[PDB]
Amino acid sequence: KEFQSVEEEMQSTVREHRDGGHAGGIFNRYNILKIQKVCNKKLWERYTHRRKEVSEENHNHANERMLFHGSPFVNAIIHKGFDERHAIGGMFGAGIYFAENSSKSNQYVYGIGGGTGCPVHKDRSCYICHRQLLFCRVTLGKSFLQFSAMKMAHSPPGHHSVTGRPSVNGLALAEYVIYRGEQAYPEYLITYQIMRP
Ligand SMILES: NC(=O)c1cccc2ncc(-c3ccc(Cl)cc3)nc12
């Protein structure tokens, strides 16, 4: 039920991508293989301690959202947490990026722009190799709304995150950026394949 809800979010938020599948592959849906709840007490507490601090700075409201994250480093993330020291060249600078559309995070699973794809077949559209996405609790707090590229090193003054909003000459889909790794928790590890349309 918790997992059916995660599967529903994963499938229903897929969009057709402007790059025609170059980065993440060609698909309309996934084959969801496994959904695992990550239980890392030390990381959870690091997350909730910061969430409380952010809520206190944002009119008693954490502005928490469940968002996707794609990375070749899912294993390190679930053990050590998100780490801004790994994050300036990105559209919103040196942040940790999240999507509300699973297929946008799927474009980052094998690297920026999909890298060279899966390690076995070197295919960004591999229907064989199993992929992993994270479905994360993300504390946005007071989120700075931005439409165009703004290369920042940290959250804007008085803010806790950046929300990249869609615009005609800019973003096709939203994205959410934090500048402190403790503002996200890798709640669910989703193992899946993209499916041939
Ligand atoms: N990861 C996501 O799910 C993700 C979702 C949404 C937008 C992103 N934009 C940039 C990057 C990004 C990935 C790696 C590096 Cl090194 C820098 C930025 N990731 C993104």
Ligand SMILES: [Zn+2]
């Ligand atoms: Zn493959």
